[PDB]
């Protein structure tokens, strides 16, 4: 059969605007043919780590639906996106299960997500009282009470829960912006709509 309904990976990898790590965008990929070879054609990847599956055998497995999570982080925080990792991003921004079945793709974006005067449009939650559950997103922006008195707006002991990265081109690698895409493969009881190319 002729290959039809290619899964739109370019809308996720070649997107102009990437979401923040606290409001990571989840795109549902279902009912399409997934050619995992066109991934290397978008941009030179810096990291390609597949967990639970083999990257070369991805074209042979059929799945029901695939979820693509995209966000921006710094270079030092790309180590936190992994099953069973600690850190401010891995605990309070985006956490993966211990039985995660998928691949994480990361690449440096210092040429796009960095401004000469500082790109303060990307926010991250520094700390929360309870750690996030796997695949949980916290978008609430209520003022965090660091002291022992109830808060009434921004102050000395009050804190806005979201902090900006401030990416600058002169920053060394590690503080430069990195765009990360996380793929989750789901095997439910429904018919597997996402299959690989058949030749």
């Amino acid at each position: 059969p002729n290959v039809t309904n290619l899964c739109p990976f370019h809308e996720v990898f070649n997107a102009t605007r990437f979401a923040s790590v606290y409001a990571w965008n989840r795109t549902r990929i279902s009912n399409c043919v997934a050619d995992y070879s066109v991934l290397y054609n978008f941009a030179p990847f810096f990291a390609f780590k597949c967990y639970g599956v083999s990257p070369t055998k991805l074209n042979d497995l059929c799945f029901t639906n695939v979820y693509a999570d995209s966000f921006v982080i710094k270079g030092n925080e790309v180590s936190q996106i992994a099953p069973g990792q600690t850190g401010n991003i891995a605990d309070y921004n985006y956490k993966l299960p211990d039985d995660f079945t998928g691949c994480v793709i990361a690449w440096n974006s210092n040429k796009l997500d960095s401004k000469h005067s500082g790109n303060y449009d990307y926010w991250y939650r520094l700390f929360r009282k309870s750690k996030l559950k796997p695949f949980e997103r916290d978008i609430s922006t209520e003022i965090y009470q660091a002291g022992n008195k109830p808060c009434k707006g921004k102050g000395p002991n009050c804190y806005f829960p979201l902090q900006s990265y401030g990416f600058r081109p002169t920053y060394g690698v590690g503080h430069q912006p990195y765009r990360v895409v996380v793929l989750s493969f789901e095997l439910l009881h429904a018919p597997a709509t996402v299959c690989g190319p058949k030749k």
Partner: single-chain antibody
Amino acid sequence: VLTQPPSASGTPGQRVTISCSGSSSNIGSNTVNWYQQLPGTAPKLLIYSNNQRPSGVPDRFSGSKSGTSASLAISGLQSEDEADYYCAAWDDSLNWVFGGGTKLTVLGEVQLVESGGGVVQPGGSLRLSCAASGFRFDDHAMHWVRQAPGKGLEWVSVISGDGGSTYYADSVKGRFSISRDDSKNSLYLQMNSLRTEDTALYYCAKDRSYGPPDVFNYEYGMDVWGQGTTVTVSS
């Protein structure tokens, strides 16, 4: 372990492929690198990301990876292509593995200076130093590679750009210690309890990647090589 053909041959003008067989934990899972070492010189990075080529490398070299195997195509052989070619990759066992090397025979500025070598008794101590110039020292990882006289390359240790992640080979585990000093652009390697097998030519290599190879498993590569120092373990 990566398996390479022991030798290869080709007349000028032809193309010669150099095979490299690995496991699912080094090739396929991670990326493959290729290095050229002319007789009496330091190795040169030829290919990274399994198909990418640095700026100062001719277009005659092309890389390919299919599953757990890789190959290097050299179209239009010249007399300058007669050298040793190594297959490199990062194994999921947290160690850098070289392919042993394939000797090719034809028929018809960033600088790293190293110091600290010498002759020591079996069981002594020695510390090697490496001075770096011409680049941001904290943005690039550093490697240590030794080469026995007339033998192949062997990876020793690696330290990340931030100095947080350090990995050592199984042969030198518990005896060698790596450290960096960003304030003075120096790379150190403390060698304790040396064996006779540690007699080799130690190289100081700069990595094009910042983080450790297990995190950035798709862009690592020993870009800049320095003049090695000879250590001798003799009684």
